[PDB]
């Protein structure tokens with residue numbers, strides 16, 4: 001489209017080795033936005049790895065990944081890189097790069113993901129986001145409501161509430177639906193509505209259709225580390 005994040009291809013890497021995955025940005029000024037990386041282990045689970053500010057090369061990591069992941073950029077080629085060291089089978093996962101905006105603190109454009117397979121073969125301070133239900137089977141046309149509760153208030157210093165909703169359709173990268181509780185992102189239909197305050201938030205879908213099916217994730221970026229809910233799989237009965 002206008003903006004694209006193009007990640008490198010799938011990687012089959014031996015245990016102990018390192019891998020360096022790339023994310024080429026096109027369609028926007030690379031140095032004007034934070035680039036964030038996310039791990040998704042086989043299923044419904046997004047984890048923040050870290051951020052890089054391409055203008056300075058400055059980084060912040062999720063403690064879980066500090067010592068494991070190294071983020072760099074090449075400004076001349078508008079490319080972000082994530083290196084992972086001392087690889088084991090636990091690193092096998094899909095990795096995404098995503099652009100983070102300032103106005104929403106939300107992840108507005110995502111890479112397509114890179115699958116890493118690590119094999120020898122030939123071919124309580126963090127804020128917890130509790131999403132319910134974990135599974136929402138419906139009939140087409142039904143209304144759907146998904147809840148997200150945070151362990152601490154999501155109200156930021158500036159009075160805004162950095163609670164966002166993403167939809168990951170089967171086989172695709174997550175996409176931004178709602179930012180800052182209730183703001184629909186460009187292109188998102190009016191059947192989606194977000195509400196709530198403090199610690200309790202709700203995403204409503206007024207009449208479910210096939211394009212709505214997938215896994216919904218809430219996320220908060222008020223607090224560092226950024227965190228994600230466990231997902232709600234919306235599917236047809």
Ligand SMILES: OC[C@H]1O[C@H](O[C@H]2O[C@H](CO)[C@@H](O)[C@H](O)[C@H]2O)[C@H](O)[C@@H](O)[C@@H]1O
Nearest residue numbers: 031032033034053055101102103104158
């Ligand atoms: O809107 C993105 C930028 O926000 C800040 O900069 C703006 O707001 C500042 C006051 O908080 C003004 O002084 C500044 O002129 C504005 O551009 C932030 O400092 C920037 O890093 C962001 O790019």
Ligand SMILES: OC[C@H]1O[C@H](O[C@H]2O[C@H](CO)[C@@H](O)[C@H](O)[C@H]2O)[C@H](O)[C@@H](O)[C@@H]1O
Nearest residue numbers: 152153154155156157158159222223224
């Ligand atoms: O009014 C609620 C709190 O607002 C601020 O703290 C929140 O926003 C911070 C980022 O600006 C977060 O790091 C923090 O974890 C949030 O709780 C303010 O600093 C707090 O004193 C207020 O309790």
Ligand SMILES: [Mg+2]
Nearest residue numbers: 029031032033
């Ligand atoms: Mg400028």
